[PDB]
């Protein structure tokens, strides 16, 4: 009953935030800045992007005038209570507003991109009775039927990368919102598709998240591949530098196995010209190879090691047996 109040406010605010972006003077600085970073108004209306004015109480007064309890709206994640107990203010101020739809198309939260210095850069609704990030996959309600048509899903972190991908014609794109992939997410993904492509940031945190996401996904029978962004780029940086078509064609459609990805990951921080690092890398890769099913799959990757380092397969195989 109170949850229905929080839902109706979110539906209303999506329309209004969008209205302020498209139809007011204040919205201009955000609208122009959006267009200047690749947004088309086809995208703005498609994702119903909006703008929250740079005020403390504009939406607080807006909701109270319309009969909404401030404390409900605080439980909804829309307002914050003054630490000193004097009242309530707008959680989302001077941000570009991205609505977060649950898997049936109902708005349950927002993500706001700071225009300016306020922190965080990206502010998200907290846990509310409506919004549980451990079960929601951003863009899933729009992506579901593309995931089934393409027989694959492309999994990002954060909404920004998803919108760049959709723009790049990867409509089977979804993301986690401020959280690692969870078992609830894997159960939803598995019900809908077998193939999953991870496309994460290429910094050290992204690499650990890729490794962790793919262990959860493989345990449940998902066929997993890894999109690998070259240099030190995140997906959106690639899309802007080279364009959506190259991203789709040479990144998403050339994604590699989990084992091929580990074989790159395990290289970082190692000097493969140093005998100790060279050996540790090899042994680390053979330990992963030993968890693969079947000699054929194992042999495929043992052969890359034999070839890249000019080592006999006999001694790589002898070391493999140790681990198994």
From Swiss-Prot:
EC number: 2.7.7.101
Binding site for Mg(2+) 2: 201, 203
Keywords per UniProt: DNA replication, DNA-binding, DNA-directed RNA polymerase, Magnesium, Metal-binding, Nucleotidyltransferase, Primosome, Transcription, Transferase, Zinc, Zinc-finger
Cellular component GO terms held in the UniProt record: cytoplasm; DNA-directed RNA polymerase complex; primosome complex
Catalytically driven reaction(s): ssDNA + n NTP = ssDNA/pppN(pN)n-1 hybrid + (n-1) diphosphate
Family classification: Belongs to the DnaG primase family.
Oligomeric form and interacting partners: Monomer. Interacts with DnaB.
Protein name in UniProt: DNA primase
Species of provenance: Bacillus subtilis (strain 168)
Name of the coding gene: dnaG
Shown residues in whole-protein numbering: 112 to 435 of 603
